[PDB]
């Protein structure tokens, strides 16, 4: 028993992860069974509530990927309930300051390293009675860097011992820097900001991840040395596939 | 108006989506594409009645006609779906004239059928004039997917109150002793499919089929199918994800 | 005690609510009014089994007897509702003595019927003595809503184990070739309703009916109906909202 | 495509809205189809959770009213997830200070006018790819005035550019001022407070709304020049209608 | 591999859990204990299809084979459960050879049965080779719980495609005119149970039974039952809570 | 109509309560029907979301125990929505300071004693139109003491008028004091801390509760004079009962 993403990193390999915005277990299991190391459930920009995330985490684990959640907000009590429901990866949006990164770290570890409340319903079933001793290793925590403010604060954020590193939200970052909501961009200012965050993460001996909208862009990010790359949202892949089926059906 | 009936009345076939995943977000998103209808599969999916109800609403808001492929040809199940705003019904494994008569009985009020009266959602869409035009608001297709159905095709097509038939080519292939392959080239299955189509059109009825690709759907439209579905949500998403991963991993 | 049976044993009819909206808050709130029973409609509503279960609990806490009008006269569906704490069953479209016998078979343990034993919620309410008094805890009504049922009334009423019959006057009006109007004045429908009532009372059975207004319910109570429902939640809420809007907009 | 409430206001007309405390799609659609411009779903004083609100917003839009939510609390991340689920009106309870009104404004607009996170799942489907350019206009935001403290701070609250105005909670206001929980009151002190808030809202070129328990009271509020009037809660109208049916059924 | 079939192929019986409570947390937790299978009861529980679906996934992750005791022996209900990853089916009240043939028809693809093809979850577990080995992945047991079933035992056991029979001793006791007691000592019921066991083993079939205690389950295993369930989640939890309260209150 | 726990306390009797971590109504009703005065639903260390807690509160009340909730976090708006859903007992985890105890008190009372928002959907049905006058008595509020920090602050926490007292989280307390996650412990340091909290609660004329993992430990806590004792979690009792059934089934 081990965190599949931590196993990638311990073997000097990056992790590739899925991204779900659609509630339900069937597609969660089917995607987890593909060559994804993790599958992230998006609880920020989706209609997925806690009652719907709980059985999705089970389905991903059965499919053979590490269950991750991108939370609605950086809130310790929300993050703790997800950990106890068998979320083994947490990505907290809009972490703009060292203090906010400490708030995330506080949720991911038991005392004395954090203030995580004890009652691990699903981790105890997966890991057994030996869980508390290894609990910190079973969990991956990434602070999202999505703003001018987070970019300015990146060295202070990376100095927080309890987070594994940072996950870049490139569309919110492009918007905050005064651009359109650019997806998978080469825009020089946005790309220089993202390169800066990766360079500082690795200099600090921390991990860096990035959200991607396509397989093509994910290959570029992996080939730049990102540690955790997501591609691409279930609803986006499904809509694109339907549009293409319809286009081919209705062609002369 | 029933968007599929509007296609037909205007001399055009209908192209439909096919959902095996529960939920409203992809249902609305696919309904807003160039689909005339979106079918929710209650047979080969985890979708129960509590989940189908909001999906019907989402499809209608997206601007496609909501259809349901039911778990079974059962009149009371069909009547509850109709009153929940399912405006097309595809009933699996209709094998006999009696079974086609059971389907027709569910889709029409007395004296044409025995549909129980309590049209919760259709009354909201169509108003107090609903009863008079109820029959035309609903499209009903009996599924031809066995040797027995294929043997009994003319008598199934004889039943007034069904709009026509919808081929289940994987179940048909399997019952003919062939592999249940999507979009099959198997000569006997392809000949059985063309026979059902010709028989439906000769009886003044409509015919539909399930497809797994845009390419196959283009052929069935060209061959004169009236209602073509392509392709299942879970299949399309799985194949897309496989491609993304293969692109990403180089 | 079954509150409806207590009304009957004390020489009083029962007045019931009628829910087509899922959820527990209005179910408890209507149960706390001067209703003896609240019926949950699983036929002409979006309510599935997962939603009916907590509604039964809410009605019982509010202090009305929980009833269910099932989607269909199916023994296994009725048995699951009984074991979930439905203490009244109204089965739609009971047209023959055989169909009434199917309903009675579901409502009684061997040797009277064939009800499967596993009474999850009734055992909590009634304790370990439940089996001996099980029959008296449940009220079962066959719906008379077709020409065929009306023709077969005496033989439906002959079936021991059903408490009596419940008229579906909109389906009856429609099957008699009339408008399916709530609370109809149509002479033949009104005469058919009085006939069913007289036949039930002559057979020593109970009779109920669906009403759309307090005024009509008052008449049916005065005419000697034993179980009168008025009026559906969605209808009452819709008419109330229309009035509020008309008041507000001046 | 336009916000039906904003269209009323642009045409110098007030908006009349429904108020739901009962979960489910069928009554939501049926009421939306009546002569209501909007229907508000109450997530503060109801058992409605996020999983239940999501399909109700769809049902209201299909019925042809603008979907609104009265949120449980003034929390930016909760408000953002509702916007991305196709809530086009937000009413945030207990907004007592200018700082709290700024917190609400921050959630309702993308950078640089706010800090709303980008991922508009349902608005993108309703409005298309041209959504970001008009996003602020598609959304109506009202701060609730329900306390002595909010009343004292009304000019500071109204000075916040990012809110369309204020929505009065007359029962909580009556309670905070030391009265019984008065519904649709003429009580001189409560009525003078409410008149003050309307006068200051209109002086500031802002909109003012009020919650009503009856059609009669809603007519009075509309005829005083309120911009957004709700009447009346589904559970209240249903209970009153049932009581009257029973009273008529059991009459001699 | 089907874990129960693996027990049988290795000359061992299977011990199973029994859930009447909906939800995934206790389902996974009991599946991780020394149970070979966990049965979800859809007959005497509030569990609907929407709730059973995630429970099947939880049991499989816990490392027990997921089974379902269905509400009724209905082919379309069984086929939807199979496609949702129910790998054992126990059908209540199988009373005749015809009813056993109806069960067998649902569990096998043509030409052995008439199972409709669309194996959503089994295809994920078993891959594209699923069709060829489908029959062996599923365990099907007909319930013997009436006088009529007991009378028709040899002809039920004659049906190829059913793995064997599962005794419902409380319904059997009640239909024989005895108390529906868990783990009964009633001489005629005990003799009926041993007869069904001997008949199943003589026909080369498997036999199972429902138990209420570890002590009784130990005896049935020793007597040579192939599939023993003990004990229902709600019963075990209720008795445990009663003990805790009695300990606490002194 | 009365709070069953307050009735115990008014009659000089302690209350014994159940503890649910499993969603659903059937076991909630069955346990409520046993000799428990209350049943607590755990929304911190369970997968229970608001949509699942709502019908469980109904089931417990019908079974004839007082419905309690141990909340995910000490958040006033979450606590208010539970009160309006017919939670009549609130246990808020991780209350570490007098200020946090005041935050809990603020949620449990209407103005002027608190700032609870008015809209009591279920309490109004249970208690009728006379509810506001007795509302404070219908509700039991307990602040959880689970940390070194809460222990140091126990006299300041107990000085908050609006809480009935404190509920000890012995496992989180043992962890915070540097021990293993000890369940039902006699460990001298943890036991002295718990005895101190009980002694200070009773000296302050307040009530004290404690979570137990067994019937045996609950008897000891009752016999020490605790006012509110819980035993034992549904999932723990069910797992132990299954293990024993299996052990007996597979015995030689
Ligand atoms: Br792959
Ligand atoms: Br398109
Ligand atoms: Br009343
Ligand atoms: Br209107
Ligand atoms: Br074990
Ligand atoms: Br007890
Ligand atoms: K994988
Ligand atoms: K369309
Ligand atoms: K359901
Ligand atoms: K009552
Ligand atoms: K409207
Ligand atoms: K196991
Ligand atoms: K009790
Ligand atoms: Mg972002
Ligand atoms: Mg088929
Ligand atoms: Mg009817
Ligand atoms: Mg929920
Ligand atoms: Mg208020
Ligand atoms: Mg049985
Ligand atoms: Mg704790």
Residue numbers in the entry:
A (entry chain AAA), D (entry chain AAA), F (entry chain AAA): 0 to 251
B (entry chain BBB), C (entry chain BBB), E (entry chain BBB): 1 to 250
Which text from the study accompanies this structure?
In a previous study, several variants of SwHKA were created at position F210 in order to probe the influence of aromatic electron density for CH‐π interactions with hydroxypyruvate. In the presence of ketoacids, bidentate substrate coordination affords M2+ A,S as the lowest energy complex and predominant state in crystal structures. The M2+ A,S complex is additionally stabilized by side chain interactions from the protein environment with the coordinated substrate. In particular, CH‐π interactions between the electropositive C−H bonds at C‐3 in hydroxypyruvate (HPA) and the aromatic residue F210, play an important role. Alignment of WT SwHKA M2+ A,S with monomer B from variant F210W (containing M2+ A,S/M2+ R) showed no significant change in protein structure by the F210W mutation (rmsd=0.190 Å between 243 Cα atoms).
Here structural analysis of hydroxyketoacid aldolase from Sphingomonas wittichii RW1 (SwHKA) revealed a dynamic movement of the metal cofactor between two coordination spheres without protein scaffold rearrangements. Holo‐SwHKA forms a trimer of homodimers, in which each monomer adopts an (α/β)8 triosephosphate isomerase (TIM) barrel fold. In total, holo‐SwHKA contains six equivalent active sites; each of which is formed from amino acids from two different domain‐swapped dimers. The transition from M2+ R to M2+ A,S is induced by bidentate substrate binding and occurs without a concomitant rearrangement of the protein scaffold.
